[PDB]
Design a protein around this ligand. Structure first.
Ligand SMILES: CCCCCCCCCCCCC/C=C\[C@H](O)[C@H](N)CO
Ligand SMILES: *C(=O)CCCCCCCCCCCCC
Ligand SMILES: *C(=O)CCCCCCCCCCCCC
Lengths: 268, 56, 8, 60, 283, 60, 268, 8, 8, 132
């Protein structure tokens, strides 16, 4: 644009929340599908849906994590990471069924003298591998759903051996995307790269994806967000550099069915 | 005036990520803030101010 | 005015 | 020479009017009409040589 | 289109009845009032009705100046322990009871206000001295403006506050005020608080009076005698008369049946037995 | 700007009129016209969802 | 109706809740105004409102109370009585501003051999009188807002005297409607009578009423529901008869403004 | 004058 | 009169 | 501008003087009024005015001052600051009356690693307070 406008500079507004960025590398719309409400032709539950709109379809910022030379990577699941986020989480636990899309905005700035590259991946049905070699598909619900704080990748598979009282948790090795496939191919999934010399954010617009029109949000996660250091953090000459990564996520076109009393999950 | 019935709320500022500088650069700096009214703003019931006086 | 002024 | 104008009615009990007549020759004797005009703040809020578009970068 | 002064409905002639229509029988459980007229239950003649409800319209009911307060000021020499007396009054209709009761037939109201001031003075001592004619200043101090501390401090300059300079012995002073509420109507009753007590925060902080909205609704009137004091002492009183003009009212209420006790609905012990003895079968 | 209206004549000595002129710009300064409207009490006397016919059974 | 229909038999449906009644005495719409959403001409807060619709505009049943020969009466305030009711209460505490109308359905059945009459009154701005004769307008927020359980009338004004540490609560004498006016005139307020020989329920549809278009629901109650025994319970010959009264209330056309973090009121 | 003098 | 009495 | 042009890059020319800048934040025209000559409707002295044009309406550079961590600020008054500037000052002292507008260009460059912010204010009738 001769009158100013650019790819690198965006403003996103949803509800009472606005995000600005002066160093973007465009935006990604997963599979080229923008979030939408459930159509009558595809509808299944017959009751009048709850649609929270601005009350739930706004930007929630999760806890800032920290990137260092030893970081192997981080992961989150949706809707799980947002389960305690304001009126979205409440509508989620009061209803049997729910569906949502998301705008995911990953934030990581640094300086013209730093370097490093984060791979940001949105994975549909991101089933991760467990820590056991004596039993399979055994990670516990509590261990599988970290909530907002997420989990992390490790560079080494180290099998839980306390057979008497098992850890019952994931053991996601980074070069295998925690699921037995090579990280180098995760680019077939909707993604963006935050390369510190180029951009300071990643923005992904995620449609609702599933084999059902609507499902149990408490039982099932539709999307996994995986962030892995494609190229390690490095700065000037400091052996221990650090920079923050902040995740802000907004539910989009979300609707809920099957109202009752609130679900009080055992999360510990 | 300060008054609970017509209280307006809270403005606050936070670090989203953090301020990052290279070497040879200052690590502390200032921000300045400004306030102005939008085109939908109005005032009424003219009154004397307390911001000036003439004690004697 | 005509009407508005009534006159008597 | 009477001047008729309308009141902007606040709390109600058609348009209501009031009437004014000037009794003096000097305009300084006249009351204040309060029929005043508003202007836009541009000359103070945006005194810049190049017109600004709020959706575009202030600096380009 | 029916106006407050139109004549009421004519009585129509009606004769004997023997049918299934049952005007007289009803069921008040429904919440309704049976809209019966005399020709429903007795034989009526025809009457051309002339009476009107002109005087019981809401305007006509309130179209009277009513005393809302008496302010005392004087004009004596300010001396080390006691000062020349100026007066301060927080504007309200609840310091007296008569108009308060009338307004409280309703939950909410809207009106322009007409304030009339009657000023009377007299000599307080068995002196013989005199006093030249007094000029009084009635200043309106809206919430936020500097309240006067002395009969003669800088606040009486009134650069922006409205003031009335009243000369003694002239016709009583009068001004009008628009509907000045920060709401769309004045609330005669407010079932709430102006503060939410927050768990997380200490109780003393969360607290506030029941039924009170802004601590200072409409500010105050401050009255003084402009004249420097005479050797002789003169006391003056300012009676304020309030009249609601161009009034509208909403949501009717039962009238106050027991003595007012404070600015709220509170009632005091020993004032709660209004009705008097009268037997069931005694005319 | 004069406003002419008729008096509802009480005790008599054609229609009689009186005249009003507003001197002030603010409608709050205006006297009360007393030209008020009446309404019907329905909203208080009969606030029921189903319209009532007085000759028929209130409850059926 | 020749094809069957009657005043006494109603079905009300709001959201996933249906009420039936075979012994009604019609319905009342307060001041003849049906609940409605805030119009643009009357709007005040400029932000996009939250409108919970079916999630909050449904029937919530409060705790059943019991009517006896000694009962003097009961009261509740709205929205306070619904402050903990599902997604209505949540939307209420997350927003600074809110407005709502209500369908109030009072339930009390008995038998052809019982007798008694309950007056059900919906009072706009139902300010009640305090227990003190040494200070006024001093009932505490906690004491003023009983929540769902409501409060009760007494037949006797009995002044709190512990001046050192005052009760700070209401003392509502029944024949004075707890507010210094005679109960016999409370019929100028929207009402219905449950007369046991005639009907077993009272239904009132209450519009949002206030001197503002929208207000603080946490600070301010718009409506009071007062239930008083106009004619005392009596049955066959038992000196101690008892029958239940159940209150079911539905928020109607409710909308909220000013979203933030949740309000956590000190209610004890 | 005609107009403006309004009459009722 | 017509002229003027000016009106606004 | 697709063909290059920008807010930050300006060239100003008055008389035999040209200023260039590659890092401007636009220009300000006080109260949105561009300088102008006195109109006949507003004129007051009846004599034929002197109008020096290019000889006086050019850029005069004053003495460079220095900004440091202890600087509290600087001020100047117009026309006073220009009283000795070439043919402008001369025309000024030879006549009883005079009027002028001004283009004020404040210059302060540094580096991508410096920081600081100067407020530049043009005050009409800038009466300052005395030391007594
Ligand atoms: C020089 C005289 C100026 C007098 C100016 C008076 C302005 C203030 C008017 C007072 C408005 C009071 C209306 C009455 C009370 C409210 O209705 C209730 N507290 C409910 O909101
Ligand atoms: C225009 O003014 C023509 C109509 C005149 C109407 C009557 C004026 C009332 C008396 C005014 C006298 C003027 C006093 C200097
Ligand atoms: C409409 O008003 C035109 C006719 C005017 C008639 C004479 C008015 C009498 C003097 C009014 C002066 C108004 C004082 C503010």
């Amino acid at each position: 644009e001769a009158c100013g406008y650019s790819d690198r500079v965006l403003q996103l507004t949803l509800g009472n929340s606005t995000i600005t960025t002066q160093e973007a590398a465009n935006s990604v719309v997963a599979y080229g599908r923008w979030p939408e409400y459930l159509r009558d032709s595809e509808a299944n539950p017959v009751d009048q849906p709850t649609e929270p709109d601005v009350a739930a379809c706004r930007f929630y910022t999760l806890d800032t994590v920290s990137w260092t030379k030893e970081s192997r990577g981080w992961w989150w699941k949706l809707p799980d990471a947002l389960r305690d986020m304001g009126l979205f989480g409440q509508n989620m636990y009061y209803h049997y069924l729910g569906r949502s899309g998301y705008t995911v905005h990953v934030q990581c700035n640094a300086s013209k003298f730093h370097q490093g590259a984060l791979g940001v991946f949105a994975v549909p049905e991101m089933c991760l591998a467990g820590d056991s070699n004596t039993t399979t598909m055994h990670t516990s619900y509590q261990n599988a759903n970290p909530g907002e704080k997420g989990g992390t990748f490790t560079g080494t598979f180290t099998p839980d051996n306390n057979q008497t009282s098992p850890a019952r948790r994931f053991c996601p090795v980074d070069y295998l995307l925690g699921n037995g496939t090579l990280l180098g191919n995760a680019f077939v999934f909707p993604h963006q790269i935050i390369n510190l010399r180029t951009n300071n954010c990643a923005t992904l617009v995620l449609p609702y994806v599933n084999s059902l029109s609507i499902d149990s949000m408490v039982k099932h996660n539709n999307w996994g967000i995986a962030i892995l250091p494609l190229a390690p953090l490095n700065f000037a000459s400091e052996s221990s550099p650090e920079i923050p990564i902040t995740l802000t996520i907004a539910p989009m076109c979300c609707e809920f069915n099957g109202l009752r009393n609130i679900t009080l999950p055992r999360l510990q | 005036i300060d008054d609970s019935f017509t209280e307006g709320g809270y403005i606050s500022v936070f670090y989203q990520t953090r301020i990052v500088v290279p070497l040879s650069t200052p690590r502390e700096m200032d921000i300045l803030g400004f306030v102005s009214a939008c085109n939908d703003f109005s005032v009424r019931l003219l009154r004397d101010t307390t911001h000036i006086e003439q004690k004697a | 005015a005509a009407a508005a002024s009534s006159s008597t | 020479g009477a001047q008729v104008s309308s009141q902007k009615v606040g709390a109600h009990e058609s348009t209501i009017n009031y009437t004014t007549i000037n009794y003096y020759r000097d305009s300084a004797s006249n009351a204040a009409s309060k029929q005043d005009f508003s202007q836009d703040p541009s000359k103070f809020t945006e005194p810049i040589k190049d017109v600004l578009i709020k959706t575009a970068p202030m600096l380009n | 289109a029916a106006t407050s002064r139109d004549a009421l409905p004519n009585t129509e002639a009606s004769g004997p009845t023997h049918s299934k229509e049952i005007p007289a029988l009803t069921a008040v459980e429904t919440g309704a009032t049976n809209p019966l007229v005399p020709s429903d239950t007795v034989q009526t003649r025809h009457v051309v009705q002339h009476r009107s409800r002109s005087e019981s319209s809401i305007e006509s009911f309130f179209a009277r100046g009513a005393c809302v307060t008496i302010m005392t000021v004087d004009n004596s020499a300010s001396t080390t322990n006691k000062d020349k007396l100026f007066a301060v009054w927080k504007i309200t209709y609840k310091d007296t009871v008569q108009l308060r009761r009338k307004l409280e037939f309703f939950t909410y109201s809207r009106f322009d206000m007409e304030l009339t001031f009657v000023v009377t003075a007299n000599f307080t001592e068995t002196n013989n001295g005199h006093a030249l004619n007094q000029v009084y200043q009635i200043m309106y101090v809206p919430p936020g403006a500097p309240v006067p501390e002395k009969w003669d401090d800088y606040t009486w300059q009134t650069s922006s506050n409205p003031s009335i300079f009243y000369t003694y012995g002239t016709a009583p002073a009068r001004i009008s005020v628009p509907y000045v509420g920060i709401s769309n109507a004045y609330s005669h009753f407010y079932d709430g608080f102006s503060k939410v007590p927050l768990k997380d925060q200490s109780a003393a902080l969360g607290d506030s009076l029941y039924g009170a909205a802004s601590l200072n609704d409409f500010g105050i009137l401050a009255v003084r005698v402009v004249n420097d004091h005479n050797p002789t002492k003169v006391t003056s009183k300012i009676r304020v008369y309030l009249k609601p003009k161009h009034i509208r009212v909403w949501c009717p209420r039962p009238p106050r049946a027991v003595a007012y006790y404070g600015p709220g609905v509170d009632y005091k012990d020993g004032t709660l037995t209004p009705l008097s003895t009268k037997d069931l079968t005694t005319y």
